[PDB]
Amino acid sequence: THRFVQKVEEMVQNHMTYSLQDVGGDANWQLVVEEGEMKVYRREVEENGIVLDPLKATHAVKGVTGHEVCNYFWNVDVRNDWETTIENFHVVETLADNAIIIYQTHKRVWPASQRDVLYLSVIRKIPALTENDPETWIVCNFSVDHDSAPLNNRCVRAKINVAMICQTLVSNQEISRDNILCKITYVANVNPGGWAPASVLRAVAKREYPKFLKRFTSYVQEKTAGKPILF
Ligand SMILES: O=S(=O)(CCO)c1ccc(-c2ccc(C3CCCC3)c([C@H]3C[C@H]3c3ccccn3)c2)cc1
């Protein structure tokens, strides 16, 4: 239906195969920040002296569904209500009702050059693998090449592979939001795309990933409160 259908299936299946695994028991992941049910881990990885540090976080959010969380994370029309590190944003291409290509710039992290990013953003429902298992809602944001890439001489091009992966547990009567819990696994593999001082990048990640997870999940709770549930 569009030229990236195969690529999207590969990227989504890779996350379903590899990104949901538990890391509580895994000494290969460093637990860097914990705030209640939010647990943020990383691995320290550098390629040619540039930090790549894979980031993986888990969180458990009361009173929202995975379909709601993924809709709010994917919908560009609400981005400004929760994002705090974006300078500019442009939708470059619409591929399908659930897949777009975006260009964005991030606020500069001194003393490195400002970064920009050009990525496909897709939202998918993955049916339960065995009938005992939960369904999954996933948003995957991953870098792609495009000709309508902006000339932006202030920016170095980063590359990203990010997924927000959600599974929803629920306890003639509707289910209340009191009885719904969204289990999130968030993974971010960011390649800065050129020089940056490692200690600064690592301090920024350790502050900004928890700040994002807290602000974004709180935002979804706030916007859904008192509205009918979208499962
Ligand atoms: O979840 S998303 O898809 C949401 C749509 O935007 C996402 C999140 C984060 C990034 C991103 C892009 C650039 C950087 C670095 C690279 C060198 C200089 C800036 C970082 C590192 C610094 C970390 C960070 C973490 C959270 C928010 C922003 N910054 C992160 C991109 C996309």
UniProtKB/Swiss-Prot annotation:
A single BP term in Gene Ontology: endoplasmic reticulum organization
Binding sites annotated in the UniProt record for an N-acylsphing-4-enine: E83, Q104, N141, Y186
Effect of mutating W110A: Reduces affinity for membranes. Abolishes ceramide transfer
Annotated keywords: Coiled coil, Cytoplasm, Disease variant, Endoplasmic reticulum, Golgi apparatus, Intellectual disability, Lipid transport, Lipid-binding, Phosphoprotein, Transport
Domain comment in the entry: The START domain recognizes ceramides and diacylglycerol lipids, interacts with membranes, and mediates the intermembrane transfer of ceramides and diacylglycerol lipids. The PH domain targets the Golgi apparatus.
Entire-sequence positions represented here: 390 to 624 of 624
Subcellular location(s) of the protein: Cytoplasm; Golgi apparatus; Endoplasmic reticulum
Key word Metal-binding present: no
Protein's recorded name: Ceramide transfer protein
Gene Ontology CC entries for this record: cytosol; endoplasmic reticulum membrane; Golgi apparatus; mitochondrion; nucleoplasm
Record's function text: Shelters ceramides and diacylglycerol lipids inside its START domain and mediates the intracellular trafficking of ceramides and diacylglycerol lipids in a non-vesicular manner.
Disease: Neurodevelopmental disorder with hypotonia, speech delay, and dysmorphic facies: An autosomal dominant disorder characterized by mild to profound developmental delay with hypotonia, delayed motor skills, impaired intellectual development, poor or absent speech, and behavioral abnormalities. Some patients are non-verbal and non-ambulatory. Additional features may include early feeding difficulties, poor overall growth, seizures, brain imaging abnormalities, and dysmorphic facial features.
Post-translational modification: Inactivated by hyperphosphorylation of serine residues by CSNK1G2/CK1 that triggers dissociation from the Golgi complex, thus down-regulating ER-to-Golgi transport of ceramide and sphingomyelin synthesis.
Native species: Homo sapiens
Source superkingdom: Eukaryota
GO molecular function list: ceramide 1-phosphate binding; ceramide 1-phosphate transfer activity; ceramide binding; ceramide transfer activity; identical protein binding; kinase activity; phosphatidylinositol-4-phosphate binding
Residue ranges of domain START in the record: 1-225
Free-text tissue specificity from the UniProt record: Widely expressed.
